[PDB]
């Protein structure tokens, strides 16, 4: 199991001001450190917060939080679940700030919520470092959904909050699961998250930033735009089909949806056609890494364990241990190992 610290900063809080925290299960024996970002969506505006904090509280406050969770999927500390990192140190961050981990904004008289997630990592670093995280040779930063679009804006800036504080041999890397979304034309938008940015005081990535430039920010959380703008080695986990990508797209067949289905697959495939480390099945499903059956699914036959130790052994192309894995086939469970 993993077990809860709250932040002993208290002024680094959850959307509600009580204070953000992180679940933790050390390794002694393991110079390797897993930090995992959870996902659940975002909040954009008083009303749609209000909403949520009445029936996602959990997402928006630790005064609820247990002591305790189990650790599943590439959190788990048995080899037979876990044939990756099972002897690594864990980290479970839970995601309570409603704001893809971009936000650095404190609760005041003239906001009713904070929204913190990109001060909440830092400060989740900074205090694991006296608790063994300086003497890590690597520091993972995995997520699954809005955390893995979370892993995009943050990685780099973990990577420099090291440098300066003087950690030069800590090796840092990110993990997006399910965070790589297209800004396409819908079936039946954007201006959600560029309403976001401004009601949260979002941050992006500083080299994505100057391309873009002020207003349009929003594009760096759209990863095919961002991802080339980045310097820590990344790993991109991707169902070519996800389910929140066609949510947003209005699709819940005839010629005019068989189309808009085989495209969405084909763009997708295309945008990571430059992305040397990937693994993208042809499934239509939404999230993988932390749920216990991650090992099942394979491309090209390697499932996604095995590619993230060939990724392992290529920051150290291999003989039989790849590690860009794209699945070709143009419909949703072409793949047979596809998640039922
Ligand atoms: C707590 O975190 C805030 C925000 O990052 C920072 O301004 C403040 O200095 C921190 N407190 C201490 C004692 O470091
Ligand atoms: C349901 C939903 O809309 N999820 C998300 C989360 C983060 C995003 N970053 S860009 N588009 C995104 C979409
Ligand atoms: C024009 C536009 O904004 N299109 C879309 C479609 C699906 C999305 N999923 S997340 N962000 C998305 C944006």
């Known amino acids: 199991d993993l077990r809860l610290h709250l932040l002993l900063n208290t002024s680094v809080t959850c959307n509600d001001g009580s204070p953000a925290g992180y679940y933790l299960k050390e390794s002694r024996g393991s110079r390797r450190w897993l930090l995992f970002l959870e996902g659940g969506w975002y909040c954009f505006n008083r009303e749609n917060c209000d909403s949520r904090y009445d ?36 980290v479970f961050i839970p995601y309570c700030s409603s704001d893809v981990w971009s936000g650095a904004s404190s609760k005041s008289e003239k906001n009713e919520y904070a929204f913190m997630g990109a001060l909440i990592i830092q400060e989740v670093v900074r205090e694991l ?53 297209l800004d396409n034309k819908q079936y039946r938008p954007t201006e959600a998250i560029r309403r976001g940015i401004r009601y949260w005081n979002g941050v992006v990535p500083e080299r994505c930033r100057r391309q873009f430039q002020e207003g349009e920010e929003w594009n760096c959380f759209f990863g095919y735009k961002v991802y080339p703008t980045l310097r820590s080695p990344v790993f991109v986990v991707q169902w070519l089909f996800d389910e929140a990508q066609l949510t947003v797209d209005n699709v819940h067949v005839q010629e005019g949806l068989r189309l808009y289905i085989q ?24 999230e993988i890494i932390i749920r216990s059956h991650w090992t099942d699914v394979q491309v090209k036959g390697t499932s996604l364990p095995r590619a993230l130790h060939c990724w392992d052994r290529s920051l150290h192309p291999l003989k039989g241990c790849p590690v860009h894995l794209v699945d070709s086939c143009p419909w949703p469970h072409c793949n047979p190992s596809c998640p039922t």
């Open 129 to 181: 470092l006296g608790r063994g995280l300086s003497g890590a040779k690597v520091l993972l930063l995995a997520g699954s959904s809005a955390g893995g679009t979370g892993v995009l804006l943050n990685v780099d800036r973990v990577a420099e909050q090291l440098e300066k504080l003087g950690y030069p041999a800590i090796q840092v890397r990110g993990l997006a699961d399910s965070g790589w979304f």
């Open 55 to 90: 029936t996602m509280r959990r997402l928006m406050s630790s005064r609820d939080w247990p002591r305790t969770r189990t650790g599943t999927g590439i959190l788990s500390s048995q080899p037979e679940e876990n044939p990756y990192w099972w002897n690594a140190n864990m």
């Open 263 to 286: 495209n969405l697959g084909r763009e997708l495939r295309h945008t990571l056609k430059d992305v040397p480390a990937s693994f993208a099945p042809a499934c239509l499903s939404h």
